[PDB]
Write a protein that binds this ligand. Sequence first.
Ligand SMILES: Oc1ccc(CCc2cc(O)cc(O)c2)cc1
Ligand SMILES: [Yb+3]
Ligand SMILES: [Zn+2]
Length: 606
Amino acid sequence: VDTCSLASPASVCRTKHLHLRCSVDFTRRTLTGTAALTVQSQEDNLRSLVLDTKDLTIEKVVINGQEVKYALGERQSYKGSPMEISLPIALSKNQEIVIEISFETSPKSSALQWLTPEQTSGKEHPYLFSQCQAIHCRAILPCQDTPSVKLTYTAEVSVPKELVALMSAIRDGETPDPEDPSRKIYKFIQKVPIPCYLIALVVGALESRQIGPRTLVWSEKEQVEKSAYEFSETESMLKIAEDLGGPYVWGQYDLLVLPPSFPYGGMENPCLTFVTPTLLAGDKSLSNVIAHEISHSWTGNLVTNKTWDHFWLNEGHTVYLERHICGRLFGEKFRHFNALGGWGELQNSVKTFGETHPFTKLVVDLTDIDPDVAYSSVPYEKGFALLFYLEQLLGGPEIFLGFLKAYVEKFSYKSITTDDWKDFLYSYFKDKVDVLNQVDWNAWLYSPGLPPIKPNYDMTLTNACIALSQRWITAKEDDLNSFNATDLKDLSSHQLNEFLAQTLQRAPLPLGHIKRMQEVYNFNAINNSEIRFRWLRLCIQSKWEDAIPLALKMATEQGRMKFTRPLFKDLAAFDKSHDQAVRTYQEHKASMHPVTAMLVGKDLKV
Ligand SMILES: Oc1ccc(CCc2cc(O)cc(O)c2)cc1
Ligand SMILES: [Yb+3]
Ligand SMILES: [Zn+2]
């Protein structure tokens, strides 16, 4: 059972296909149209079924050409309202019907952000994007809003003719709208069955440039050139991923670079990954996010978590593949550097949440918990740490990647739980079950806090970062003159980042040390978003008033939650910036992404 969904479960009926016909009304901030669901009964004598909805207006529900009865239940908070449809004829097992629902979204759909022309790059046209994961697809269309059900889809989307629509699907043509010549209809086909959280739409003034044999980058005209360069490693990463995971089955791998309020680093929408413009460092140094989204084309999109309790299956295996792609590209010592940095992020989250916090468990029971509130690094890094531990336990990366390939093969086009994964792990490693029974499964999967065993990490690339951090932490005032720009000479952008991560773990430092660091290193000049983030956090936690406007500027000029949330939190904790932080949120909140708005409000207690 999926406790985040109000709809009939997969054991009762299963959506096979969605045909979406809709129109994007920028004037009203609504999507309007029909969702035609092809539904297969899994039961004898099926006479009704229930769908997920959230802030939808239902006009009518048509089956076999006639309107039928339906009822909306009472809102159940972040789950929305259940929609019961009365079937006109009882269905036998495996019988299929088509239910055509006429609906309209609310301007406040938590799935959607509607941007004014002023919030875009070109300043002449508005822009819309969706973010359905985890349980926001129900806020666009009525559906069984659970990743335990996979469907194919087709769509026809009418938008102002000067704008472009794209979806998580193969582009299937465009024509004028016959109902309104000021409009264009874009068509789409997704032939591969997908969980509904992978349904995605963008409408905006979009241009494209080809960057590989199966990849266009899409953005507003002013970002295209920069994006083409930033993401030029994409085809080489796809090739490596195919080697590790098996055939890429989705046809195209395009990239869409969103406006700066996009709430995450990436979203693995099939055929069209969405990314944050904060990846545009100018030097490709944040391309691990592309490797991560590419990896989801196997782990997440082919093998999918059956409910959001097992989200770690999606993320852990993805981070595991991600770090492999980057290890292939840049060396095994780099894979270990990233893995070790990941362990540090995990310490930070466990430290932040508390070592007994429920959200520090690998598997989390999400009944009554809004998944957006639970979301953190834990599933990523505690999941990664388990697989890395297991890799070492069972014989190394070549051996463990054999298992990853077999696991993707085995569960392609299915939705699985943690027990399903573990079962296959024991089946694949039947000759090593003595070694598998050494792992403390209950601790790793179900206990809060740091994992019971820390893997082994090569420290080669890390040592210089630790060394410099320690010099600063142990320095007294009479040592500050010894620091010099030449300190950073042999450090990559990745190492400069890790240096700051290490130092930030011991924050606050004395204000004079921070002032000296800006004097000698000019971190204020760095536009790499990861580096700038940690630097400004270090400044604010170390009580440097000068950094206040910089931190406020970063927190609001982009909306990647990774950055925006902890910046606002830090600025709220610093008495000098507290009032401004709260006032700034209040002023920007209406024009924020709905989920980000909600979470920053909670963080600030406003
Ligand atoms: O956009 C998204 C995507 C996934 C989630 C699910 C978040 C989550 C966190 C966690 O610590 C354990 C889980 O089992 C699930 C929430 C929001
Ligand atoms: Yb001294
Ligand atoms: Zn992911």
